[PDB]
Assembly symmetry: none
Homo-oligomer: 325 residues x 4
């Protein structure tokens, strides 16, 4: 069986083709802005322009046509509405034209499920992107949230901090570079709030201490990361200990960060359990993860009626029953 | 319609008879324990000997007969194997003898659900008994667990501490009374471990400092209570903040404690939300909670097959699809 | 905090002690009436003689003293003058002797409000007792009356009918039992007159047809009940439809009747809304309902001056600004 | 004291100047459409164009200037938002320019209160306009609703019926003309639903029987009115009987209708109580009623802060506390 997956919850439009065991195609195009941040109306146009090229390109790279495709899958949410609607219309178009089944896929679940194409069985998952930050795990038939940002994503937080320091886009690796040179740990607001995560307090304080001049730049970068990431490890560890699972996965654009990986590996080694990060192309926002989850769903008898394919800008992870596990 | 409910997960055998909106009968008999603590065999013997008398008493106060009953509900778990087995045999026997359908009820869920009989819509529930301690709330089709004891129930901890102080059964109210006179906090191990609760460390330390003769009992009683209850409140508050639920309920045998009630009201009042405790007889282990949940289940179409009524000594709260909410 | 509440609007003297979430004590003593019916003087004598014993009993079960009480609440009206006067004198005396603030409580409001102690948010309430029959609900800062008896309470009507049939006190349950065997509706005067209720016409007609010897008692009992209760349901349903409130509560001595409960569940179930009846002891005239409302009032800053505690034999439900909701 | 009142909840823009006892000015301009019905965006423009002329004209007819005006009052709601906002901006403009007090006035209350300038003390009021239909009375400190349309106003209902019959705008008096010639009463759906009014069922049936050809036109007109008006009388009578008030007033554009007046007078005479209809210029939508209610409010110490003058498109009558009665 083959599945076509279209992803566009955010800036990236991604089209991907997979079967059960292998990825046949995985093609990308992220919206590049000079100023950064979220622009929902621009991405929608972006996704509409690139729909035909990437779609034509993915089918080619896999050496297949739409009649070989068994199911069409799309990122239903969560995310920016105008982009979700572009994705959904194109997906609905194809199901009507080729009379193929169509499934609505949860972006967040897709991020964790893709690891299961790589011999990971039942992990606690840490999803960290620009605007998403979530520790999730399968418990009682659904992917439950064990901790999430109450405001801004870790990725976006590292961006604001970078532009404040004058650093050039992309902010991610630039703050990571500096961090590796810092040698004084300066105290900053803790990012764990009850069960969840908060980066707003931490972010604005880190900026206030930067503006004071009293500290070395590298030292603040080091501290800003450590605190943010220590919080991510703690919530992840809380989940591991609670669920008694023996695998941890790290996913999302921010999985790039080596210091993050490192801290999670330290934690996973103490407890003596598996730590897996998928290849970067199935880590960042991509269509293959959508196609893959989409395919499992379909193989388990899930097929959406048109009425059921409305976009869900605020899609909760615990809304989808995981009948295919 | 009517439902008959049998509770016997521990030392209480409870028999209740309830309709959708009234409790027709709620009767009790408890095994006496001189030394205190858990005794699986004697409990099963207790329940066996008391089944017929208590059932006769129930039907009497309810002023009804087994023919008027529409469904038979029993506490399927979690609890002490041998006592569960006596409850399930008694419930199965009734089911055949009077050609009545049967439902197996989760003891913890029942404790929370019973509050819905009188108005509560969708609570975060703190269940605290002898050996149980859980914060649980409905989310994604199931009652999920937000924090629980990793070792011993708060009830049994307070009881060990009381037996240590040479206090006459029952421990709770006596320790509660000494705590009111306390005017100095003496530091003891925090009882929050990650997401969950732990009371062993706290209990052994509290005992150690008692034996030193260095401190006033009242200070130690107050310090034991403040540490343990603050733990309970924090875990509850964590769930409240995360689920954004606008009501908290306090259930279990340990709900008798006014200091815990007070600490919870402060937490709920500061958040501008509501706090409820069901009447004492519906709060402690009882058959009416089993009957009420049983009845809600049956009306939603849940009716057990005999092999589905195998006891579940370690029944997980999240195993049950709450299809009747 | 604690509140002590005295009820004595009719033949029951009720004394309750309640905190915000538990009923510490709920005690009763009722004047015996051979012939049945209303006797203002003997009731005032009853309440005078029983005040001290019942108060002593209450403080005992509650396990507290008058010094631990924060506020004294009493049933100010509506009810029988001489009995109200005994209640208010007793409550005023306590207020000075123990330097406690005092609140006057509306008996009908209390009946509804008590359901809020255990979870009910904003009901349409049907209050049905001996001489009271009202549909009332919170709207525009007050409990407004949507329909009420123009003559006699449903309780007393059922009782007159029972004494007529030569039935041994109490009437309600006996007429209820005969009604269950009824299989023919015999037409009787509709009890809805405009917005309000009327039971005289119905009662005299039912008596007339009984005396004719032409009909089975069971048919007449059933017909009396169906006519009167259908009236009650319609007026309640009218308020439900108009206020668009999503919960109905049934309170008063007459709530014991299962046929009325059933008829109300049908009405509430067809509208997809909720129906509750408080436990029996909080349903009938009692002191705990007075205490609970009293306490909610005091916490909102209502504290009476002595001249504000003049009895109100004809206390209107809408006189009270419900500032504590 | 003098008050300026601006009215524009609907099609009419009305400016009026009153003192306590007399109306100094009362000027109008209703939006005239050929097709009828509600057009919110057009009326807003209408009200903005006519603001200056009518305002200039009213001040002239009263022989006064804005510095003589003590308070500015405006129809805050209920009604069509875009028109309400035009009214409110102009009102806010003047309070800021002349630093005079400003009150927000309820259109519906204003309709009933104006009668009190004419020696009516405490009436049950029937407000019938195009889109409003409400029986209201002062009870427990507020104007409470005793019955209201659940769909369309009686005025608008008589309009749809008129255009279906081909009759020329205004539909009101034309259907009244025909009605007076009908002599067969044809059965049509009753317009009382529980506590309230519904004209939709009745309206569409009346049309279906017109389209059948089986009946005389005049006879349907007679019946359509009788049924609609019989319903209005019944709800009004229900209120009278319940509140025990001895005055009834009839207000709104539809007060024009003589048959309506007549039916209400028949009812008011049987019960032997006062029936008053104010002069047509204070009956239909006008500013003088706004100014008058506005003035009483002010005299009783009500003065709005700017924050409190937001338009209320869905203003409930029982939201305004009547502290000036």
């Amino acid at each position: 069986m083959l599945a076509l997956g279209i992803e566009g919850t955010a800036h990236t439009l991604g089209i991907g083709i997979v079967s059960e065991d292998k990825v046949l195609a995985n093609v990308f195009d992220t919206l590049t802005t000079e100023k950064g941040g979220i622009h929902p109306k621009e991405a929608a146009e972006h996704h509409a322009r690139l729909m035909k090229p990437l779609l034509r390109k993915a089918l080619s790279e896999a050496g297949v046509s739409l009649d070989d495709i068994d199911v069409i899958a799309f990122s239903q949410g969560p995310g920016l509405g105008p982009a979700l609607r572009v994705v959904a219309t194109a997906a609905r178009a194809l199901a009507v034209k080729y009379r193929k089944p169509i499934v609505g896929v949860n972006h967040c679940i897709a991020h964790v499920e893709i690891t299961k194409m790589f011999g990971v069985k039942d992990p606690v998952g840490l999803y960290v992107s620009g605007g998403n930050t979530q520790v999730l795990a399968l418990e009682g038939g659904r992917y439950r949230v064990f901790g999430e940002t109450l405001d801004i994503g870790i990725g976006n937080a590292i961006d604001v901090f970078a532009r404040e320091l004058g650093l050039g886009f992309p902010g991610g690796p630039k703050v990571e570079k500096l961090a590796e040179k810092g040698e004084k740990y300066i105290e900053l607001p803790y990012a764990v709030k009850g069960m969840d995560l908060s980066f707003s307090g931490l972010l604005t304080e880190a900026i206030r201490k930067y503006r004071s001049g009293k500290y070395r730049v590298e030292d603040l970068a080091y501290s800003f990361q450590e605190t943010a990431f220590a919080a991510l490890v703690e919530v992840t560890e809380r989940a591991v200990a609670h669920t008694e699972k023996d695998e941890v996965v790290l996913v999302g654009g921010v999985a790039a960060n080596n210091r993050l990986r490192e801290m999670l590996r330290i934690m996973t080694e103490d407890r003596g359990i598996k730590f897996f990060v998928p290849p970067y192309d199935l880590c960042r926002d991509n269509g293959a993860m959508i196609a893959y989850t989409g395919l499992r769903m379909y193989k388990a008898g899930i097929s959406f009626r048109l009425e059921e394919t409305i976009v869900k800008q605020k899609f909760r992870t615990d809304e989808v029953e995981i009948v295919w596990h």
